[PDB]
């Protein structure tokens, strides 16, 4: 019922840069807003609370700023080790409210560009048996994002594809990638070409391999 | 000073669950809340429900939760979340956490105010599903046979259609971990849920072992790997 | 001890 907003959603920030993140509270709470950072699989790790008091044993490249309605949070000397969700949290009242904290915000650190390496691994011999057989193409190491397209005998795949994204090394900026196509034995047993095709930027790198060769 | 939740599991729709949160190194006061905050995989923060931690009965709920989620000391160290009529979108890691405030005054009494969490739990993971618990069938991930071997090599193992969460995957029983890359589960139309691992090794010669544990189900497999 | 959250006075 008070209504943290944050936005943007997501930003962007190149390593050394600067970001900022905002919250808007729908009523005043009086400097008390808190803000976290969260990796993933962790709890959430305070930064600082009173609008602008810095928490204990955290890096002061973090300033929270702000007052009455509008709060912010600056990052300075970006790193690696920042890419994480960001959340604001008003800390006036848990009377009558539904959230105090906003809905977060996504930080995507920009380090140094890597060439992702492709590899497609054809089922295993007894996954046909199972009735479903699944593809597992795999972009290692590399930034900015990629884009997964799969072909099979050179018609494009559409469905049955799912990607999976590692979050960003925390020392250098780097995603990993699976894309993985499921099929049912039956439909992998008509066709003859599986073909992954992962596309950073100007440059892709296409695997192939043919059923019958496996 | 820490905290550990417990009592996550996985589910039917309808079911109620309790969840308990155990401090260890201080014990409830006057000076905090206690309280829980749950997320949805993928999904932001959600505050649900503080209990005081002085002598006196105060708790707030979130708006969402009072009516069907009860917080409650049960001892100095423990603090419950009962949770009844659950479904799927009550599916979350739910943490524990210790909340700070600051005792203004007013016109004849003191109120709590200034809430930040300065202390969390693990979390216990609770997966609300009309799916049965299913091990985890495990494939190995090996370049093709009708390829030329090359000295350098990745290999992994795909961990499919399991539930609820987690798996873990080792590689020769923890002793290999350089080139180590498992990417974050999947949870497929059915329900269940995938995750691959992949490693990369220069000796083709040798085989190596990917351990998946999926503790859910008590079950343990260990793939070997030829390229 | 206190009685409430601020927002019950």
């Not at chain 3, 001890?1 to 006075?9: F, M, P, T, V």
Request: proline share 5%.
């Amino acid at each position: 019922d008070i209504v943290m907003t944050q936005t943007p959603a997501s930003v962007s920030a190149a390593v050394g840069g600067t970001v900022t993140i905002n919250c808007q509270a729908s009523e005043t709470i009086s400097n008390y807003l808190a803000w976290y950072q969260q990796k993933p699989g962790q709890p959430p790790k305070l930064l600082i609370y009173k609008a602008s008091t810095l928490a204990s044993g955290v890096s002061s490249r973090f300033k929270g700023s702000g007052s009455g309605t509008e709060y912010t949070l600056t990052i300075s000397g970006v790193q690696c080790d920042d890419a994480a969700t960001y959340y604001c949290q008003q800390g006036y009242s848990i009377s009558d409210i539904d959230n105090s904290f906003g809905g977060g915000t996504e930080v995507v650190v920009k380090g140094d560009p890597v060439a992702p390496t492709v590899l497609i691994f054809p089922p295993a011999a007894d996954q046909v048996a199972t009735g479903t057989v699944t593809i597992v193409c795999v972009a290692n190491k590399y930034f900015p994002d990629v884009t997964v397209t799969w072909e099979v005998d050179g018609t494009t795949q559409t469905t049955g594809i799912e990607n999976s994204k590692t979050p960003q090394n925390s020392a250098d900026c780097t995603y990993n990638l699976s894309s993985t196509l499921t099929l049912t034995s039956t439909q992998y047993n008509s066709h003859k070409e599986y073909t992954c095709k992962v596309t950073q930027g100007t440059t892709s790198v296409v695997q192939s391999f043919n059923r019958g060769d496996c | 000073q820490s905290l550990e939740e417990s009592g996550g599991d996985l589910v039917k729709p309808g079911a109620s669950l309790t969840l308990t949160c155990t401090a260890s190194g201080f014990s409830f006061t006057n000076n905090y809340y206690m309280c829980w905050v749950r997320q949805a995989p993928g999904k932001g923060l959600e505050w649900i429900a503080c209990i005081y931690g002085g002598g006196r009965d105060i708790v707030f709920y979130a708006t969402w939760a009072k009516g069907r989620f009860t917080i409650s000391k049960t001892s100095s160290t423990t603090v419950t979340l009962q949770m009844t009529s659950l479904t799927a979108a009550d599916t979350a890691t739910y943490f524990c956490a210790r909340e700070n405030f600051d005792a203004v005054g007013v016109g004849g009494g003191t109120y709590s105010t200034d809430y930040y969490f300065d202390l969390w739990g693990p979390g216990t993971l609770v997966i609300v599903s009309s799916g049965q618990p299913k091990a985890p069938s495990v494939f190995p991930l090996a370049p093709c046979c009708g390829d030329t071997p090359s000295a350098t090599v990745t290999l992994g193992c795909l961990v499919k259609g399991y539930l609820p969460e987690p798996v873990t995957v080792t590689w020769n029983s923890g002793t290999l971990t350089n080139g180590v890359r498992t990417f974050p589960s999947v949870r497929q139309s059915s329900g269940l849920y995938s995750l691959s691992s992949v490693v990369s090794v220069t000796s083709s010669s040798q085989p190596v072992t990917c351990n998946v544990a999926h503790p859910a189900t008590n079950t343990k497999v260990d793939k070997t790997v030829a390229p | 001890e206190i009685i409430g959250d601020i927002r019950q006075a």
